[PDB]
Amino acid sequence: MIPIDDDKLIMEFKDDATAFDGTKKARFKGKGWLNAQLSVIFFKLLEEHGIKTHFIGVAGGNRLIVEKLDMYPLEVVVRNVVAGSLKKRLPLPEGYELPEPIVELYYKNDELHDPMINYYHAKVLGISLDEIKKIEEIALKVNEILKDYLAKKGIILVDFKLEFGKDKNGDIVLADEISPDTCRFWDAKTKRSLDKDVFRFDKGDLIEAYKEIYERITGEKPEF
Amino acid sequence: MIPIDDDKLIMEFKDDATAFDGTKKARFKGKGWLNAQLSVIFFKLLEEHGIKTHFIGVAGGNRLIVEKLDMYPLEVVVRNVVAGSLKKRLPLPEGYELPEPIVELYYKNDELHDPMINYYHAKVLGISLDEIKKIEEIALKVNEILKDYLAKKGIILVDFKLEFGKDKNGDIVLADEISPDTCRFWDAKTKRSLDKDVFRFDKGDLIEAYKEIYERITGEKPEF
Ligand SMILES: Cc1cn([C@H]2C[C@H](O)[C@@H](COP(=O)(O)OP(=O)(O)O)O2)c(=O)[nH]c1=O
Numbered sequence A, B: 001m002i003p004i005d006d007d008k009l010i011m012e013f014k015d016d017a018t019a020f021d022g023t024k025k026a027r028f029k030g031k032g033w034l035n036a037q038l039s040v041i042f043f044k045l046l047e048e049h050g051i052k053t054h055f056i057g058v059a060g061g062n063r064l065i066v067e068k069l070d071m072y073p074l075e076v077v078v079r080n081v082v083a084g085s086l087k088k089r090l091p092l093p094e095g096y097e098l099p100e101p102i103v104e105l106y107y108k109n110d111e112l113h114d115p116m117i118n119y120y121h122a123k124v125l126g127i128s129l130d131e132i133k134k135i136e137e138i139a140l141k142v143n144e145i146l147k148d149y150l151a152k153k154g155i156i157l158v159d160f161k162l163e164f165g166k167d168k169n170g171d172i173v174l175a176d177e178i179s180p181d182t183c184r185f186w187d188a189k190t191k192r193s194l195d196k197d198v199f200r201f202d203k204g205d206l207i208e209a210y211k212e213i214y215e216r217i218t219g220e221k222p223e224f
Protein backbone atom coordinates (compact mmCIF):
# COMPACT_ATOMS: atom_id res chain seq x y z
CA MET A 1 0.00 0.00 0.00
CA ILE A 2 1.57 3.27 -1.29
CA PRO A 3 -0.64 6.25 -2.44
CA ILE A 4 -0.82 7.62 -6.01
CA ASP A 5 -3.67 10.18 -5.86
CA ASP A 6 -7.30 10.40 -4.68
CA ASP A 7 -8.55 7.54 -6.85
CA LYS A 8 -5.82 4.89 -6.64
CA LEU A 9 -2.86 3.37 -4.85
CA ILE A 10 -0.18 0.71 -5.22
CA MET A 11 -0.49 -2.62 -3.45
CA GLU A 12 2.92 -4.27 -3.19
CA PHE A 13 3.22 -7.96 -2.35
CA LYS A 14 6.34 -8.79 -0.29
CA ASP A 15 8.31 -11.98 0.35
CA ASP A 16 7.54 -11.76 4.10
CA ALA A 17 5.32 -14.31 5.79
CA THR A 18 3.80 -14.08 9.27
CA ALA A 19 1.65 -16.42 11.35
CA PHE A 20 0.25 -16.82 14.87
CA ASP A 21 -0.42 -13.12 15.55
CA GLY A 22 3.04 -12.31 14.16
CA THR A 23 5.01 -14.59 16.50
CA LYS A 24 6.19 -16.69 13.52
CA LYS A 25 8.10 -14.94 10.73
CA ALA A 26 10.09 -15.97 7.66
CA ARG A 27 10.89 -14.81 4.13
CA PHE A 28 10.34 -16.77 0.95
CA LYS A 29 12.07 -15.46 -2.18
CA GLY A 30 9.44 -15.25 -4.91
CA LYS A 31 6.28 -15.39 -2.71
CA GLY A 32 5.36 -11.74 -3.31
CA TRP A 33 5.45 -12.35 -7.06
CA LEU A 34 3.37 -15.52 -6.85
CA ASN A 35 0.77 -13.91 -4.57
CA ALA A 36 0.57 -10.86 -6.85
CA GLN A 37 0.04 -12.95 -10.00
CA LEU A 38 -2.51 -15.21 -8.36
CA SER A 39 -4.51 -12.26 -6.96
CA VAL A 40 -4.57 -10.80 -10.49
CA ILE A 41 -5.89 -14.06 -11.95
CA PHE A 42 -8.53 -14.39 -9.19
CA PHE A 43 -9.59 -10.71 -9.42
CA LYS A 44 -9.99 -10.96 -13.20
CA LEU A 45 -12.00 -14.18 -12.95
CA LEU A 46 -14.37 -12.58 -10.40
CA GLU A 47 -14.71 -9.39 -12.50
CA GLU A 48 -15.83 -11.48 -15.53
CA HIS A 49 -18.45 -12.95 -13.20
CA GLY A 50 -19.72 -9.50 -12.23
CA ILE A 51 -17.93 -9.12 -8.84
CA LYS A 52 -16.75 -5.52 -8.18
CA THR A 53 -13.10 -5.60 -7.05
CA HIS A 54 -10.47 -2.97 -6.45
CA PHE A 55 -8.19 -4.38 -9.16
CA ILE A 56 -7.24 -1.67 -11.71
CA GLY A 57 -3.95 -2.94 -13.20
CA VAL A 58 -0.46 -4.41 -12.83
CA ALA A 59 2.39 -2.05 -11.93
CA GLY A 60 5.09 -4.57 -12.84
CA GLY A 61 6.38 -7.45 -10.71
CA ASN A 62 4.88 -7.58 -7.24
CA ARG A 63 2.81 -4.38 -7.54
CA LEU A 64 -0.86 -3.85 -8.40
CA ILE A 65 -2.70 -0.64 -9.07
CA VAL A 66 -5.84 -0.76 -6.99
CA GLU A 67 -8.78 1.53 -6.34
CA LYS A 68 -8.83 3.56 -3.12
CA LEU A 69 -11.72 2.63 -0.81
CA ASP A 70 -13.22 3.42 2.55
CA MET A 71 -12.20 0.07 4.05
CA TYR A 72 -14.56 -1.85 6.35
CA PRO A 73 -12.64 -3.05 9.42
CA LEU A 74 -13.58 -6.67 8.71
CA GLU A 75 -12.07 -9.93 7.67
CA VAL A 76 -14.81 -12.03 6.07
CA VAL A 77 -14.15 -15.76 6.19
CA VAL A 78 -16.00 -18.34 4.04
CA ARG A 79 -15.59 -22.04 4.97
CA ASN A 80 -16.52 -25.17 2.92
CA VAL A 81 -14.41 -27.77 4.73
CA VAL A 82 -13.54 -27.82 8.47
CA ALA A 83 -9.99 -26.58 9.12
CA GLY A 84 -8.06 -24.11 11.32
CA SER A 85 -9.94 -22.24 14.03
CA LEU A 86 -13.33 -23.74 13.06
CA LYS A 87 -12.16 -26.89 14.89
CA LYS A 88 -12.29 -24.88 18.15
CA ARG A 89 -15.80 -23.63 17.48
CA LEU A 90 -17.51 -26.84 16.24
CA PRO A 91 -16.63 -30.38 17.47
CA LEU A 92 -15.95 -31.49 13.92
CA PRO A 93 -12.77 -32.99 12.51
CA GLU A 94 -10.37 -31.47 9.99
CA GLY A 95 -11.70 -32.39 6.52
CA TYR A 96 -15.35 -32.50 7.56
CA GLU A 97 -17.39 -31.40 4.55
CA LEU A 98 -19.86 -28.67 5.60
CA PRO A 99 -23.52 -29.16 4.57
CA GLU A 100 -23.48 -25.52 3.39
CA PRO A 101 -20.87 -22.73 3.50
CA ILE A 102 -20.12 -20.90 6.78
CA VAL A 103 -19.43 -17.14 6.74
CA GLU A 104 -17.64 -15.63 9.76
CA LEU A 105 -16.96 -11.96 10.42
CA TYR A 106 -13.81 -10.90 12.24
CA TYR A 107 -13.22 -7.40 13.52
CA LYS A 108 -9.81 -6.13 12.24
CA ASN A 109 -8.26 -4.86 15.46
CA ASP A 110 -4.73 -5.76 16.53
CA GLU A 111 -5.28 -4.75 20.16
CA LEU A 112 -8.13 -7.29 20.43
CA HIS A 113 -6.44 -9.84 18.11
CA ASP A 114 -9.13 -9.86 15.43
CA PRO A 115 -12.04 -11.30 17.46
CA MET A 116 -15.03 -12.88 15.78
CA ILE A 117 -18.12 -10.71 15.72
CA ASN A 118 -21.72 -10.87 14.59
CA TYR A 119 -24.14 -8.45 12.84
CA TYR A 120 -24.93 -6.68 16.12
CA HIS A 121 -21.29 -5.93 16.94
CA ALA A 122 -20.92 -4.79 13.32
CA LYS A 123 -23.81 -2.36 13.76
CA VAL A 124 -22.12 -0.86 16.86
CA LEU A 125 -18.98 -0.52 14.72
CA GLY A 126 -21.10 1.50 12.24
CA ILE A 127 -21.85 -1.19 9.64
CA SER A 128 -25.57 -1.46 8.89
CA LEU A 129 -27.40 -4.76 8.54
CA ASP A 130 -27.99 -4.00 4.85
CA GLU A 131 -24.22 -3.56 4.29
CA ILE A 132 -23.42 -6.79 6.20
CA LYS A 133 -25.97 -8.73 4.12
CA LYS A 134 -24.55 -7.35 0.83
CA ILE A 135 -21.01 -8.21 2.04
CA GLU A 136 -22.00 -11.83 2.85
CA GLU A 137 -23.91 -12.19 -0.44
CA ILE A 138 -20.79 -11.14 -2.36
CA ALA A 139 -18.58 -13.49 -0.27
CA LEU A 140 -20.90 -16.44 -0.93
CA LYS A 141 -20.94 -15.62 -4.66
CA VAL A 142 -17.11 -15.34 -4.69
CA ASN A 143 -17.04 -18.76 -2.96
CA GLU A 144 -19.13 -20.46 -5.71
CA ILE A 145 -17.08 -18.96 -8.57
CA LEU A 146 -13.69 -19.80 -6.95
CA LYS A 147 -14.73 -23.24 -5.66
CA ASP A 148 -15.99 -24.27 -9.16
CA TYR A 149 -13.06 -22.83 -11.06
CA LEU A 150 -10.58 -24.57 -8.74
CA ALA A 151 -12.41 -27.93 -8.56
CA LYS A 152 -12.11 -28.05 -12.37
CA LYS A 153 -8.34 -27.94 -11.69
CA GLY A 154 -8.12 -30.60 -8.97
CA ILE A 155 -8.05 -28.07 -6.10
CA ILE A 156 -10.43 -28.06 -3.13
CA LEU A 157 -11.21 -24.58 -1.80
CA VAL A 158 -11.30 -25.36 1.91
CA ASP A 159 -11.85 -21.79 3.21
CA PHE A 160 -10.63 -18.24 2.50
CA LYS A 161 -10.70 -14.68 3.79
CA LEU A 162 -11.87 -11.52 2.04
CA GLU A 163 -11.78 -7.82 2.80
CA PHE A 164 -14.06 -5.11 1.44
CA GLY A 165 -14.40 -1.36 1.21
CA LYS A 166 -16.81 1.27 -0.05
CA ASP A 167 -16.17 3.24 -3.29
CA LYS A 168 -17.23 6.86 -3.94
CA ASN A 169 -20.64 5.64 -5.22
CA GLY A 170 -21.22 3.81 -1.92
CA ASP A 171 -20.87 0.44 -3.66
CA ILE A 172 -19.27 -2.49 -1.82
CA VAL A 173 -15.97 -3.44 -3.49
CA LEU A 174 -13.81 -6.54 -2.90
CA ALA A 175 -10.36 -5.45 -1.66
CA ASP A 176 -7.04 -6.76 -0.27
CA GLU A 177 -5.76 -9.94 -2.01
CA ILE A 178 -6.75 -13.49 -2.97
CA SER A 179 -3.82 -15.86 -2.76
CA PRO A 180 -2.43 -19.03 -1.08
CA ASP A 181 -1.77 -16.67 1.90
CA THR A 182 -5.48 -15.97 2.37
CA CYS A 183 -7.06 -19.28 1.20
CA ARG A 184 -6.80 -22.96 2.02
CA PHE A 185 -6.20 -24.99 -1.14
CA TRP A 186 -6.12 -28.81 -0.95
CA ASP A 187 -5.12 -31.15 -3.71
CA ALA A 188 -8.33 -33.05 -4.55
CA LYS A 189 -6.44 -36.30 -5.20
CA THR A 190 -4.32 -36.31 -1.99
CA LYS A 191 -5.86 -33.74 0.42
CA ARG A 192 -2.43 -32.07 0.87
CA SER A 193 -2.14 -28.34 1.64
CA LEU A 194 -1.05 -26.05 -1.20
CA ASP A 195 -1.23 -22.84 0.83
CA LYS A 196 0.14 -20.90 3.82
CA ASP A 197 -0.56 -23.93 6.08
CA VAL A 198 2.70 -25.36 4.66
CA PHE A 199 4.49 -22.51 6.49
CA ARG A 200 2.09 -22.39 9.51
CA PHE A 201 2.53 -26.08 10.44
CA ASP A 202 5.84 -26.89 8.70
CA LYS A 203 4.32 -29.23 6.13
CA GLY A 204 7.15 -28.93 3.61
CA ASP A 205 8.22 -26.28 1.14
CA LEU A 206 6.12 -23.13 0.84
CA ILE A 207 7.56 -21.94 -2.47
CA GLU A 208 7.08 -25.38 -4.08
CA ALA A 209 3.46 -25.44 -2.85
CA TYR A 210 2.67 -21.95 -4.22
CA LYS A 211 4.43 -22.82 -7.53
CA GLU A 212 2.24 -25.96 -7.63
CA ILE A 213 -0.93 -23.83 -7.41
CA TYR A 214 0.42 -21.37 -9.97
CA GLU A 215 1.35 -24.14 -12.44
CA ARG A 216 -1.91 -26.00 -11.87
CA ILE A 217 -3.95 -22.82 -12.44
CA THR A 218 -2.14 -21.17 -15.36
CA GLY A 219 -0.88 -24.31 -17.13
CA GLU A 220 2.61 -22.76 -17.16
CA LYS A 221 5.79 -22.76 -15.01
CA PRO A 222 6.41 -19.46 -13.09
CA GLU A 223 8.85 -17.11 -14.87
CA PHE A 224 9.54 -14.61 -12.02
CA MET B 1 -33.06 -31.02 37.15
CA ILE B 2 -34.80 -34.24 38.32
CA PRO B 3 -37.49 -36.00 36.14
CA ILE B 4 -41.17 -36.39 37.07
CA ASP B 5 -42.76 -37.85 33.90
CA ASP B 6 -42.92 -37.12 30.15
CA ASP B 7 -44.30 -33.60 30.52
CA LYS B 8 -42.40 -32.11 33.47
CA LEU B 9 -39.38 -32.08 35.75
CA ILE B 10 -38.00 -30.44 38.88
CA MET B 11 -35.42 -27.69 38.65
CA GLU B 12 -33.60 -27.35 41.96
CA PHE B 13 -31.54 -24.24 42.72
CA LYS B 14 -28.46 -24.97 44.88
CA ASP B 15 -26.23 -22.83 47.10
CA ASP B 16 -23.20 -23.62 44.89
CA ALA B 17 -21.54 -20.92 42.81
CA THR B 18 -18.99 -21.42 40.04
CA ALA B 19 -17.03 -19.02 37.83
CA PHE B 20 -14.19 -18.99 35.29
CA ASP B 21 -15.01 -22.32 33.59
CA GLY B 22 -15.44 -23.88 37.05
CA THR B 23 -11.99 -22.96 38.40
CA LYS B 24 -13.59 -20.76 41.09
CA LYS B 25 -16.07 -22.37 43.49
CA ALA B 26 -17.85 -21.39 46.70
CA ARG B 27 -21.13 -21.93 48.55
CA PHE B 28 -23.50 -19.24 49.74
CA LYS B 29 -26.18 -20.31 52.22
CA GLY B 30 -29.50 -19.03 50.90
CA LYS B 31 -28.47 -18.35 47.26
CA GLY B 32 -30.49 -21.27 45.85
CA TRP B 33 -33.60 -19.89 47.54
CA LEU B 34 -33.02 -16.35 46.32
CA ASN B 35 -32.33 -17.49 42.74
CA ALA B 36 -35.42 -19.71 42.78
CA GLN B 37 -37.71 -16.92 44.01
CA LEU B 38 -36.30 -14.37 41.60
CA SER B 39 -36.64 -16.73 38.60
CA VAL B 40 -40.28 -17.26 39.61
CA ILE B 41 -40.93 -13.51 39.72
CA PHE B 42 -39.18 -12.96 36.36
CA PHE B 43 -40.92 -15.93 34.68
CA LYS B 44 -44.34 -14.72 35.87
CA LEU B 45 -43.68 -11.17 34.70
CA LEU B 46 -42.67 -12.43 31.23
CA GLU B 47 -45.69 -14.78 31.04
CA GLU B 48 -48.05 -11.82 31.69
CA HIS B 49 -46.30 -10.13 28.77
CA GLY B 50 -46.97 -13.09 26.48
CA ILE B 51 -43.52 -14.79 26.67
CA LYS B 52 -43.74 -18.62 26.65
CA THR B 53 -41.58 -20.00 29.48
CA HIS B 54 -41.09 -23.41 31.00
CA PHE B 55 -42.33 -22.27 34.42
CA ILE B 56 -45.20 -24.49 35.66
CA GLY B 57 -45.09 -24.07 39.47
CA VAL B 58 -43.20 -23.96 42.77
CA ALA B 59 -42.28 -27.26 44.43
CA GLY B 60 -41.43 -25.62 47.76
CA GLY B 61 -38.18 -23.88 48.72
CA ASN B 62 -35.51 -24.05 46.03
CA ARG B 63 -37.48 -26.24 43.59
CA LEU B 64 -39.55 -25.33 40.54
CA ILE B 65 -41.78 -27.52 38.44
CA VAL B 66 -40.86 -26.83 34.85
CA GLU B 67 -41.95 -28.12 31.47
CA LYS B 68 -39.75 -30.69 29.70
CA LEU B 69 -38.28 -29.40 26.42
CA ASP B 70 -36.01 -30.39 23.58
CA MET B 71 -33.26 -27.98 24.66
CA TYR B 72 -31.31 -25.96 22.08
CA PRO B 73 -27.58 -26.18 22.86
CA LEU B 74 -27.32 -22.38 23.10
CA GLU B 75 -26.71 -19.66 25.59
CA VAL B 76 -28.29 -16.47 24.24
CA VAL B 77 -26.75 -13.29 25.62
CA VAL B 78 -28.40 -9.83 25.38
CA ARG B 79 -26.23 -6.79 26.22
CA ASN B 80 -27.32 -3.15 26.89
CA VAL B 81 -24.19 -1.86 28.64
CA VAL B 82 -20.57 -2.94 27.96
CA ALA B 83 -19.29 -5.39 30.59
CA GLY B 84 -17.55 -8.77 30.90
CA SER B 85 -16.32 -10.48 27.73
CA LEU B 86 -17.75 -7.77 25.43
CA LYS B 87 -14.72 -5.67 26.47
CA LYS B 88 -12.51 -8.21 24.62
CA ARG B 89 -14.61 -8.05 21.47
CA LEU B 90 -15.19 -4.27 21.15
CA PRO B 91 -12.66 -1.58 22.25
CA LEU B 92 -15.25 0.01 24.49
CA PRO B 93 -15.03 0.65 28.21
CA GLU B 94 -17.03 -0.96 31.01
CA GLY B 95 -20.23 1.09 31.39
CA TYR B 96 -20.40 2.16 27.75
CA GLU B 97 -24.08 2.49 26.86
CA LEU B 98 -24.81 0.56 23.64
CA PRO B 99 -26.71 2.44 20.88
CA GLU B 100 -28.94 -0.64 20.57
CA PRO B 101 -28.96 -4.09 22.24
CA ILE B 102 -26.39 -6.74 21.21
CA VAL B 103 -27.45 -10.42 20.99
CA GLU B 104 -24.70 -13.06 21.08
CA LEU B 105 -25.10 -16.80 20.60
CA TYR B 106 -22.85 -19.22 22.46
CA TYR B 107 -22.67 -22.91 21.69
CA LYS B 108 -23.17 -24.91 24.96
CA ASN B 109 -20.24 -27.30 24.79
CA ASP B 110 -17.89 -27.88 27.72
CA GLU B 111 -15.16 -29.43 25.58
CA LEU B 112 -14.96 -26.23 23.50
CA HIS B 113 -15.67 -23.92 26.49
CA ASP B 114 -18.89 -22.42 25.14
CA PRO B 115 -17.51 -20.60 22.07
CA MET B 116 -19.42 -17.79 20.42
CA ILE B 117 -21.15 -18.75 17.20
CA ASN B 118 -23.22 -17.17 14.47
CA TYR B 119 -26.32 -18.20 12.46
CA TYR B 120 -24.23 -20.31 10.07
CA HIS B 121 -22.61 -22.37 12.83
CA ALA B 122 -26.10 -22.73 14.33
CA LYS B 123 -27.40 -24.11 11.03
CA VAL B 124 -24.61 -26.74 10.98
CA LEU B 125 -25.65 -27.60 14.55
CA GLY B 126 -29.19 -28.20 13.18
CA ILE B 127 -30.85 -24.91 14.13
CA SER B 128 -32.59 -23.27 11.17
CA LEU B 129 -32.39 -19.56 10.41
CA ASP B 130 -36.11 -19.23 11.17
CA GLU B 131 -35.58 -20.75 14.65
CA ILE B 132 -32.56 -18.48 15.34
CA LYS B 133 -34.58 -15.40 14.31
CA LYS B 134 -37.53 -16.40 16.56
CA ILE B 135 -35.07 -17.04 19.44
CA GLU B 136 -33.46 -13.57 19.04
CA GLU B 137 -36.87 -11.88 18.72
CA ILE B 138 -37.96 -13.44 22.02
CA ALA B 139 -34.63 -12.48 23.69
CA LEU B 140 -34.98 -8.86 22.55
CA LYS B 141 -38.59 -8.77 23.79
CA VAL B 142 -37.51 -10.27 27.16
CA ASN B 143 -34.83 -7.54 27.31
CA GLU B 144 -37.37 -4.69 26.89
CA ILE B 145 -39.78 -6.09 29.52
CA LEU B 146 -37.01 -6.80 32.09
CA LYS B 147 -35.05 -3.59 31.43
CA ASP B 148 -38.22 -1.45 31.91
CA TYR B 149 -39.48 -3.31 34.94
CA LEU B 150 -36.07 -3.05 36.64
CA ALA B 151 -35.37 0.61 35.69
CA LYS B 152 -38.64 1.46 37.48
CA LYS B 153 -36.89 -0.03 40.55
CA GLY B 154 -33.53 1.73 40.27
CA ILE B 155 -31.78 -1.25 38.64
CA ILE B 156 -29.87 -1.15 35.34
CA LEU B 157 -30.07 -4.38 33.35
CA VAL B 158 -26.53 -4.46 31.98
CA ASP B 159 -26.72 -7.85 30.19
CA PHE B 160 -28.14 -11.35 30.76
CA LYS B 161 -28.18 -14.88 29.40
CA LEU B 162 -31.14 -17.00 28.33
CA GLU B 163 -31.65 -20.60 27.28
CA PHE B 164 -34.46 -22.03 25.19
CA GLY B 165 -36.01 -25.31 24.13
CA LYS B 166 -38.74 -26.65 21.88
CA ASP B 167 -42.08 -27.95 23.29
CA LYS B 168 -44.18 -30.78 21.79
CA ASN B 169 -45.98 -28.25 19.52
CA GLY B 170 -42.61 -27.12 18.12
CA ASP B 171 -42.95 -23.74 19.87
CA ILE B 172 -39.85 -21.99 21.23
CA VAL B 173 -40.00 -21.83 25.04
CA LEU B 174 -37.78 -19.83 27.43
CA ALA B 175 -35.97 -22.24 29.78
CA ASP B 176 -33.26 -22.44 32.48
CA GLU B 177 -33.37 -19.55 35.02
CA ILE B 178 -33.38 -15.75 35.31
CA SER B 179 -31.50 -14.59 38.37
CA PRO B 180 -28.53 -12.52 39.66
CA ASP B 181 -26.44 -15.56 38.54
CA THR B 182 -27.41 -15.09 34.90
CA CYS B 183 -27.85 -11.27 34.68
CA ARG B 184 -25.83 -8.16 35.42
CA PHE B 185 -27.79 -5.79 37.65
CA TRP B 186 -26.34 -2.36 38.50
CA ASP B 187 -27.73 0.08 41.01
CA ALA B 188 -28.84 3.06 38.89
CA LYS B 189 -27.77 5.56 41.56
CA THR B 190 -24.25 4.16 42.19
CA LYS B 191 -23.42 1.78 39.30
CA ARG B 192 -22.50 -0.98 41.81
CA SER B 193 -22.95 -4.68 40.93
CA LEU B 194 -25.90 -6.50 42.50
CA ASP B 195 -25.20 -9.84 40.82
CA LYS B 196 -22.74 -12.74 40.44
CA ASP B 197 -19.95 -10.23 39.61
CA VAL B 198 -19.73 -9.67 43.40
CA PHE B 199 -18.48 -13.29 43.64
CA ARG B 200 -16.57 -13.28 40.28
CA PHE B 201 -14.39 -10.25 41.13
CA ASP B 202 -14.65 -10.20 44.95
CA LYS B 203 -16.65 -6.98 45.13
CA GLY B 204 -18.11 -7.62 48.57
CA ASP B 205 -20.86 -9.86 49.90
CA LEU B 206 -22.81 -11.99 47.45
CA ILE B 207 -25.70 -12.82 49.77
CA GLU B 208 -26.16 -9.14 50.74
CA ALA B 209 -26.17 -8.17 47.04
CA TYR B 210 -28.78 -10.81 46.10
CA LYS B 211 -30.90 -9.84 49.15
CA GLU B 212 -30.65 -6.23 47.94
CA ILE B 213 -32.13 -7.19 44.55
CA TYR B 214 -34.80 -9.31 46.22
CA GLU B 215 -35.80 -6.53 48.63
CA ARG B 216 -35.70 -3.87 45.92
CA ILE B 217 -37.88 -6.00 43.61
CA THR B 218 -40.48 -7.45 46.00
CA GLY B 219 -40.63 -4.59 48.52
CA GLU B 220 -40.08 -7.16 51.30
CA LYS B 221 -37.17 -8.68 53.30
CA PRO B 222 -36.36 -12.34 52.35
CA GLU B 223 -37.95 -14.90 54.70
CA PHE B 224 -36.02 -18.05 53.65
C1 LIG C 1 -8.67 -14.72 10.44
C2 LIG C 1 -7.89 -14.78 9.15
C3 LIG C 1 -8.14 -15.80 8.24
N1 LIG C 1 -7.45 -15.87 7.09
C4 LIG C 1 -7.76 -16.95 6.14
C5 LIG C 1 -6.78 -18.11 6.22
C6 LIG C 1 -7.66 -19.32 6.04
O1 LIG C 1 -7.70 -19.62 4.64
C7 LIG C 1 -9.07 -18.88 6.44
C8 LIG C 1 -9.52 -19.38 7.82
O2 LIG C 1 -8.57 -19.02 8.83
P1 LIG C 1 -8.78 -19.52 10.34
O3 LIG C 1 -8.80 -21.03 10.35
O4 LIG C 1 -9.96 -18.78 10.93
O5 LIG C 1 -7.46 -18.95 11.06
P2 LIG C 1 -5.96 -19.54 11.02
O6 LIG C 1 -5.40 -19.10 9.69
O7 LIG C 1 -5.35 -18.84 12.21
O8 LIG C 1 -6.06 -21.03 11.12
O9 LIG C 1 -9.07 -17.46 6.42
C9 LIG C 1 -6.46 -14.88 6.77
O10 LIG C 1 -5.84 -14.95 5.69
N2 LIG C 1 -6.19 -13.88 7.63
C10 LIG C 1 -6.84 -13.78 8.80
O11 LIG C 1 -6.59 -12.85 9.59
Ligand SMILES: Cc1cn([C@H]2C[C@H](O)[C@@H](COP(=O)(O)OP(=O)(O)O)O2)c(=O)[nH]c1=O
Residues within 6 Å of the ligand: B075, B077, B083, B084, B085, B086, B106, B114, B159, B160, B161, B181, B182, B183, B184
Ligand atom coordinates in the same frame (compact mmCIF):
# COMPACT_ATOMS: atom_id res chain seq x y z
C1 LIG D 1 -21.60 -17.00 28.60
C2 LIG D 1 -22.49 -16.91 29.82
C3 LIG D 1 -23.05 -15.69 30.18
N1 LIG D 1 -23.84 -15.60 31.27
C4 LIG D 1 -24.42 -14.29 31.60
C5 LIG D 1 -23.67 -13.56 32.70
C6 LIG D 1 -23.71 -12.12 32.26
O1 LIG D 1 -24.86 -11.52 32.84
C7 LIG D 1 -23.93 -12.15 30.75
C8 LIG D 1 -22.67 -11.86 29.91
O2 LIG D 1 -21.60 -12.72 30.28
P1 LIG D 1 -20.15 -12.54 29.62
O3 LIG D 1 -19.65 -11.15 29.94
O4 LIG D 1 -20.23 -12.96 28.17
O5 LIG D 1 -19.28 -13.65 30.38
P2 LIG D 1 -18.66 -13.60 31.87
O6 LIG D 1 -19.82 -13.88 32.80
O7 LIG D 1 -17.64 -14.71 31.79
O8 LIG D 1 -18.11 -12.21 32.07
O9 LIG D 1 -24.42 -13.45 30.43
C9 LIG D 1 -24.14 -16.75 32.05
O10 LIG D 1 -24.89 -16.66 33.04
N2 LIG D 1 -23.61 -17.95 31.73
C10 LIG D 1 -22.81 -18.09 30.66
O11 LIG D 1 -22.33 -19.21 30.38
